Amino acid sequence: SLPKRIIKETEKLVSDPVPGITAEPHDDNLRYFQVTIEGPEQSPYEDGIFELELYLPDDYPMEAPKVRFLTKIYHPAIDRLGRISLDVLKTNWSPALQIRTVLLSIQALLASPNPNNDVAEDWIKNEQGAKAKAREWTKLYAKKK
């Protein structure tokens, strides 16, 4: 028996899903989610599916979900380790936000790859080549949709 907060969030993911995103909790541990996010059209990731794992810590919703990007990807906000650069996961977190919020943010991150890190270096110096590399990696590493 989890906090009803978590049960309520889980039910809403099944009944009112977000187009292009899937989120499946695991029977053996309902705090652990397998997540797929489709590459947004008109972005360098258009053709690909991306895997993520997500975990709800004990202090949730006071504490942010832990997230790790699993698919290999060329992106200025996702490192080699799969750590994601989102303030909503750092300082901006509050119990008013949800899993949905985190997922919509990561989807938005793929939609609009913006720098401001050495991949972000490449995106500011000769960017049209970086966007081209991201598309190549999508073909190589991101499972076909």
Task: Give the C-alpha separation, 113 to 13, whole Å.
Answer: 26
For residue 1, give every residue at least 6 positions away whose Cβ sits within 8 Å of its Cβ, in sequence order, or none: none
Task: Give the C-alpha separation, 49 to 142, whole Å.
Answer: 5
User: Would you give the end-to-end CA distance of the chain in angstroms?
Assistant: 36
| Class (C level, CATH) for 1-145 | alpha beta
For residue 142, give every residue at least 6 positions away whose Cβ sits within 8 Å of its Cβ, in sequence order, or none: 39, 45, 47, 48, 49, 50, 71, 72, 73
Q: How was this structure determined?
A: X-ray
Nearest alpha-carbon partner for 4 in 50, 51, 60, 76: 60
Name the H helices within 43-145.
Answer: 99-111, 119-122, 127-141
The SS3 assignment for 62 reads coil
